[PDB]
Every structure is written in structure tokens, then in C-alpha cells.
């Protein structure tokens, strides 16, 4: 669950809980999750955040249900993405996405994940 107050510090604490590359101490603290892998998940959400500002919710919810396909498929393979969606509660946040304000909150919640990934990188 994430509200309009806490959808950022949940996303900050999520990135800090991503377990680093403790192996191979040359250039340490790198994440198993990589940048271009995470942007694939953002490009999904950062085209619904645009269309939610223009369209209504009911003419848009077909692409919203396909996020639950994509966030599982991108995490079902290449296990470092599964490390994200279990720690950052992505699949639980898609359970509560019933309105445009929450659609614009989760699509903005993903942008906080990309922000602190780039900051703590």
C-alpha cells in the first residue's frame, strides 16, 4: 500500500534493501539490478502517466492490467528484477490501482524507484 504522502520514502527504502554485489569488491556496492533493465519497467508506466492526464480511467484499464503481465514477465526471468518487485511492493501496488489518482500515483511511484536507483548507483 502507498498513499500520497509515503509513495517516495517507501521507494527510497526499497532501493536500499536491494542487495548489492557483495562479491567482487573491485567497484563495490553495485546492484544486481541494472539501469537499462529498470528503464524497461519505467517505459511501461511512463506512458500511462501521460495518457492518464488526457484520457479517462475506463477507456484505459486494458493497458493497466497488462502491467501485471509485464512486471511478472520481466521478473520471472533474470532474477534481479524479482529482487525488486518483492522488496518494492510492485505487485501489491497494482492491486489498488482503481482510480486515475492512484494510477498517477503508482506511475509516479515507479519514477521514485528509478530516481533513487540512479542516486545510489
Amino acid at each position: 500500500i502507498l498513499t500520497d504522502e509515503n509513495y517516495v520514502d517507501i521507494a527510497e527504502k526499497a532501493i536500499l534493501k536491494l542487495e548489492r554485489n557483495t562479491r567482487n569488491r573491485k567497484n563495490p556496492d553495485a546492484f544486481f539490478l541494472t539501469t537499462s533493465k529498470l528503464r524497461n519497467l519505467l517505459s511501461l508506466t511512463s506512458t500511462l502517466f501521460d495518457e492518464s492526464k488526457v484520457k479517462e480511467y475506463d477507456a484505459l484499464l486494458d493497458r493497466i492490467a497488462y502491467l501485471r503481465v509485464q512486471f511478472v514477465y520481466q521478473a520471472g526471468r533474470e532474477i534481479a528484477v524479482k529482487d525488486l518487485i518483492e522488496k518494492a511492493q510492485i505487485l501489491e501496488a497494482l492491486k489498488e490501482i482503481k482510480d486515475r489518482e492512484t494510477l498517477q500515483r503508482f506511475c509516479r511511484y515507479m519514477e521514485a524507484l528509478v530516481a533513487y536507483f540512479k542516486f545510489y548507483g
Binding site: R39, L42, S46, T47, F49, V54, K55, R108, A115
Partner: protein, 217 residues
């Protein structure tokens, strides 16, 4: 009774869909980096009248000045009595009134192959010596959007025989816009405005446009 006021109705059915830039705010973290100007209550693309005035003036400025005007006030007396001039106490309250163009065919773009009225174009640059990339996401309106365009001309009693000279200028301003672009990154596409269904009607009485709509062939 030599005060009339006429309107040029038109239909801006464009190609190479246009990017009249709007809110240059700090955008989202992976979203559209430069949106277009929109109606608030419908979130549809508009073409504002100010983007139609300065664009059609500078195209007409290159034809009717006889010297390079370093200011819009330094345009000749045929531009300033249409688009208005602030340094003249005689050419204020300029003759032309341009209104913002809105989507006419919002229903005709519905039930066809497009869904959203704006498409986002992905446009990286390439660094010259290191060949890096910097991706752009420039929103622009879709191809065959048609915009209702209206062009209020005000026949003041000081107009005399100039009414027919202005229509040689406005039609030529509508003919340069069909050659140059309209707003945004025009040397990379984004222009190609076609003005169709050009006709003049008198929204205020006592003028006869019977011998004028042939000029808008």
C-alpha cells in the same frame, strides 16, 4: 455605414504533425520531455492564435518590407495596418483578429486507426566526435487533424480601397504557411500546414464578399 467585419473560415488539415510547444516545465523522469499546448477542459491539441500571428507575420515580413526590419515596429505600413504596431499612434488596434484553432475532426479521428490525438516521437541526438545518444520524446499532434480556423478582419471606415490589397496579403500569408512550417522544430518536419475550405463570410453586416471568394479558390 462603412463599418463591416468579416471572417475567413478555414480548415487546417495538416501533415507532418505539429509541435507547438507548451509547458516547458520540469517534466517527469522518463515521460514526454516537451508537451504541446492543449485545451484544459478536453486535453486536445490546439493551435493558438499567437502562434499563428507571429509565424504568419515573419513570413509576410520577408515579402513586404523593402528593408530588414530589426523590430516588429519597423515593418512597413502594409504589415502594421493588419498585425498592429505599438510605436505608431495610428496603427494600434490592428485590423486582424486571430482566434485559437481547436480540433474540428475529433470524431472523425475517432472510429479510425488512431486512438490518442497526440503521438510521441522518439528522437535521440548523436554526439559528433564520441557518438553518444541523448533521447528526446517530443509530443506532437497526429497527421490528419483538422483545425477550425477563423480570421476576423475589421473594415474600419479608414479602409477605403485597401480591403482588396489586404486580401492579396492574407492569402499570401496563408500561401507561405503552406510552404514554411508552423511552430516547433520545423526544419525537421513538424510543419506542412494545408489551409483548406478558405472562404469569407460577413459576420457583421453591410459588405458583399461575392466578388472575393474567387480569390480563395
Amino acid at each position: 455605414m462603412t463599418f463591416a467585419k468579416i471572417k475567413f473560415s478555414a480548415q487546417i488539415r495538416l501533415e507532418t504533425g505539429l509541435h507547438i510547444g507548451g509547458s516547458d516545465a520540469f517534466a517527469a523522469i522518463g515521460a514526454i520531455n516537451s508537451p504541446v499546448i492543449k485545451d484544459p477542459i478536453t486535453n486536445l491539441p490546439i493551435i493558438p492564435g499567437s502562434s499563428l500571428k507571429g509565424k504568419m507575420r515573419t513570413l509576410l515580413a520577408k515579402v513586404y518590407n523593402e528593408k530588414v526590419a530589426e523590430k516588429p515596429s519597423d515593418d512597413s505600413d502594409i504589415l502594421s495596418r493588419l498585425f498592429g504596431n505599438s510605436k505608431d499612434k495610428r496603427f494600434k488596434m490592428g485590423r486582424l483578429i486571430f482566434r485559437d484553432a481547436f480540433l474540428s475532426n475529433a470524431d472523425e479521428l475517432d472510429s479510425l486507426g488512431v486512438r490518442s490525438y497526440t503521438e510521441v516521437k522518439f528522437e535521440n541526438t548523436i554526439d559528433r566526435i564520441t557518438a553518444e545518444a541523448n533521447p528526446r520524446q517530443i509530443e506532437r499532434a497526429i497527421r490528419n487533424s483538422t483545425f477550425d480556423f477563423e480570421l476576423i478582419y475589421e473594415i474600419t471606415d479608414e479602409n477605403e480601397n485597401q480591403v482588396e490589397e489586404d486580401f492579396k496579403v492574407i492569402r499570401d500569408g496563408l500561401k507561405l504557411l503552406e510552404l514554411d512550417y508552423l511552430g516547433g522544430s520545423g526544419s525537421r518536419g513538424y510543419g506542412k500546414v494545408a489551409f483548406e475550405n478558405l472562404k469569407a463570410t460577413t459576420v457583421f453586416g453591410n459588405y458583399d464578399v461575392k466578388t472575393l471568394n474567387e480569390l480563395l479558390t
